[PDB]
């Protein structure tokens, strides 16, 4: 520049597939199995102290992965370079992968112990059981049935509605839901789907805090916000996403507690006995799971990235990858026990103490494709408009410094002081993450060049090349 | 290249129309005549609020009006093949303004009910000397004449004279009255104009607060700075003023007080009487118009600009128009009555109501030339070292994916009655040509092709001598 | 939209008012026939006169 | 206020003139035989809302 920082773009913004040009060499790298052992419900903590000996883990909420990759250019290379290290920089693009799980077909379970339930209003029994002292009971369920994985190199971005706090403007006073306000946050690792109450905060918006389960009181419920993403042209926060999601009607109830709503009353005729009174209207549906079917497995089967909802591939502008994984429907829990005592040799409920785990996996097998950006003067100012970070990292003209001189403290050593001493010595130092919050998945040296003798591997070559298998595949018919 | 880039320089001093190609496209606009009513002496208000019910306007006050102007890439037409933004922009110049005026002839009227007055300057009735008996009588005056147009694009600065650097005992004294230094500062509208007791503050600067009529009384005086506009170098601030004035002496009067002014004795030989007693100093001429009739008026007759006095043609440069109006010459003052109960024909205040009003109408009629200016980045780099924002509102790059919008933005509100709330919605905001209220004229809604249906286009046509157009013809009557 | 003397004249006989409401032929008339004086308020500015109600 | 997806939603949506907007290249308009309209080539609409009866 001039012209102009450029032009034109904006408008329309120069897809990274017109001078990023792709090579026929082919690294593979996987996982090894990763496998997390908790106790959905809560963590389980020493209640002496404050640490975790059983820590939180679910399929219900999003397994979050910070994937962080080499970059080629640390290589020595086998030599992959036939042209100047200036002219072009290398990058990655993630060509396929696969994300399995090692888990059995089975459910997992949340409940929770005093689940703020009143009386059944699907087909009457009451209109109220109370509206005094207490009134919550045993109940537990599976939340909905969500299967979903996205893959990014940003971090995604999630919805949910806030605490838009009661405002003095329009009378709302606690005891009145507030306005709700979208607050938007990132996906991170740890944090709850949408439970079909809306996706919303429940840490602050409950305040008995007990009419839902331990889980989600102490997470943000968020649902994927993905009309924010598929705006972005490049699609670095995702260039991947797909969901199967679904839930049936259990049944209708009422929750415990009076009405704080306001009901015209003018809507109805007054009875005479129990048809005098009215119940509370904060009826809500009670939602559950759904039928597990391995015709609804998304996963174990590999998702290709030959092509990507954004300009992006996979194309590396901080060498990381974000995978988050859901998945509702392998997500077993196994259930186990350990007699107390054996001072008890008849049956007692007393004396095997039930325990409940879940088991989580996940592997990740990827195969990937070495690739270029060719870089011209032109190429290199839109670069910097865009993400100069990316220029420096590469390394790249112009830098100041120098620089010099003089330095203190001279001799001695000490001496006592004399001499200087100022002293003050450097760095305290500080501060920023750039964590934030997600599962670290090091990848740096896991980059092979077979690929005949990876499964992914092999189906790529079927799929790319037409060979090799190598010999052969299926039936015939069968 | 090229790279860089100077300015072209600034030290380069041109036309700020070497690089601003007319067209002959022409549109037509105007007002539909507007009008204020007021009272002449202040505004007469509920006296359990603050809110007025009768504002003040008179002639004697300064009409400043805020011509408002889109841009014209924005504004659409019909037929457009004479823009393309990938090479050019639009920028309005004004080539006609036509100054309706129609009201009767009449004069504001001023005055005080206790203004300072002893003796008769122009007689020898009575003594001007020392007096412990201050006379204050009803008086009443017009001002003088004063008619002005300017018209510019920039905001134009008027003089005054403040109270500058105190002095070192109180001020408004023999001998420590303070020093007075000039304040230029922005024209505000409905403050006063130059009334022939000066351009000044009264409030602080008199400290009677009770000599001069209550309109300039409370209020500053003012008269535009013509040097310094024509003395700055793009001419944008103003580049077309006119003007007629003149002030009358109504007569020299003096006021009542006693004498603080020395008189030396070494000026005039003692004797008795008159000879032994000190003299006033305290004559104040009575400002008055010397004539006033309606072809007198400098006003009802087309200004066709073509090249600005200034370093402009007439470019509406950020699509505005600042115009600052004073007419006297009509200003007219109407007096009213209410009968509540007639029960007597010879006056009574329980019956006849009398009110005074003053009604001031101004019309504002043009012909605006499109221009065009070329992007070309050594203009654009030299309009950027006089002034980005043109630049900026036009808008080039990057946006890296794009921030602002889109994102995609933005959430959400869209208001109901809850609403989302809680808001206090964002702060009110500032014009930033505008400092001071202005009598807004808003134009973004009038623009003809034709201008045979309005009597100024027409007149342009003449003038103009396309095609070739009639100019007269005779008669005219006769 | 193309369109001529003959295709108008059935342009009207299916909907007047799509015609009458662009009014880019027609007419009816441009207008005219005076803006004033003068409305509304009346007065303004300053004024706030009455208020008006 | 009683707003829900269980009564309709009906919404008036008042798009620009189009015989008179903003475009970059036209000098065969004649206003007599020809006109221009808005055709919308494409609607989505998004529902951001989750699951939930």
Redesign the interface.
């Known amino acids: 520049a ?9 408008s329309k ?1 120069v897809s990274t597939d017109e001078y990023v040009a792709r090579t026929n060499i082919y690294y593979h790298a996987g996982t090894s199995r990763l496998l997390a052992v908790g106790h959905p419900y809560f963590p389980i903590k020493k209640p002496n102290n404050n640490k975790i000996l059983v820590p939180k883990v679910s399929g219900l909420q999003y397994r979050v992965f910070r994937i962080h990759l080499p970059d080629p250019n640390k290589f020595g290379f086998p030599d992959t370079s036939f042209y100047n290290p200036d002219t072009q920089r290398l990058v990655w693009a993630c060509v396929g992968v696969e994300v399995g799980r090692g888990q059995p077909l089975g459910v997992g379970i949340s409940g929770h112990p005093l689940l703020n339930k009143l009386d059944d209003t699907e087909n009457a029994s009451a209109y109220a059981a109370n509206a005094g002292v207490d009134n919550r009971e045993c109940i537990s369920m599976d939340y ?1 049935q969500t299967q979903l994985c996205l893959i990014g190199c940003k971090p995604p971005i999630g ?1 949910h509605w806030g605490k ?2 009661p ?1 003095t ?2 009378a709302v006073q606690p005891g009145d839901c507030p ?4 607050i ?1 946050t990132v996906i991170q690792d740890g944090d709850m789907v ?1 439970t ?4 919303m905060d429940f840490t602050t918006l409950q305040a008995n805090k007990s009419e839902v389960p331990l889980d989600i009181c102490t997470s943000i419920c968020k ?1 994927p916000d993905y ?2 993403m598929v ?4 699609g ?1 926060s995702l260039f991947f996403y797909l969901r199967r ?1 679904q ?1 049936f ?1 259990r049944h209708l109830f009422n929750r415990a507690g009076t009405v704080g709503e306001n009901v015209p009353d003018d809507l109805y005729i007054k009875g005479s006995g129990s048809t005098a009174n009215l119940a509370s209207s904060n009826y809500f ?1 009670t939602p559950s799971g759904s039928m597990v079917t391995s015709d609804a497995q998304i996963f174990n089967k590999p998702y290709w990235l030959q092509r990507a909802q954004g300009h992006n591939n996979g194309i590396c502008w901080g060498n990381q990858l974000f995978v988050t994984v859901v998945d509702t429907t392998r997500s077993t829990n196994m259930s186990l026990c350990a007699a107390i005592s054996t001072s008890e040799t008849t049956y007692k409920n007393t004396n095997f103490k039930e325990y409940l785990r879940h088991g989580e996996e996940y592997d990740l097998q990827f195969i990937f494709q070495l690739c270029k950006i060719t870089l011209t003067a032109d190429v290199m100012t839109y670069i910097h ?3 100069s970070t990316i220029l420096e990292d590469w390394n790249f003209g112009l830098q100041p410094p120098p620089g010099g001189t003089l330095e203190d403290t001279y001799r001695f050593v000490t001496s006592q002081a004399i001499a200087c001493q100022k002293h003050t010595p450097p760095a305290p130092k500080e501060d920023p993450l750039k964590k934030y919050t997600f599962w670290e998945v090091n990848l740096k040296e896991k980059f092979s060049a077979d690929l005949d003798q990876f499964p992914l591997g092999r189906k790529f070559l079927l799929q790319l090349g037409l060979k090799a298998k190598p010999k052969f595949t299926l039936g015939k018919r069968k």
Do not use: H, R, W
Request: with cysteine; hydrophobic share 35%.
């Open positions: 001039t012209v102009y920082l450029p032009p034109v773009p904006v913004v909905k919805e838009g706090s405002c403007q329009v306005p709700l306000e979208l938007n949408d079909g109450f809306g996706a649902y009309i924010k705006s972005e042209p490049y670095d999601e839930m009607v549906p408009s865009m993400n």
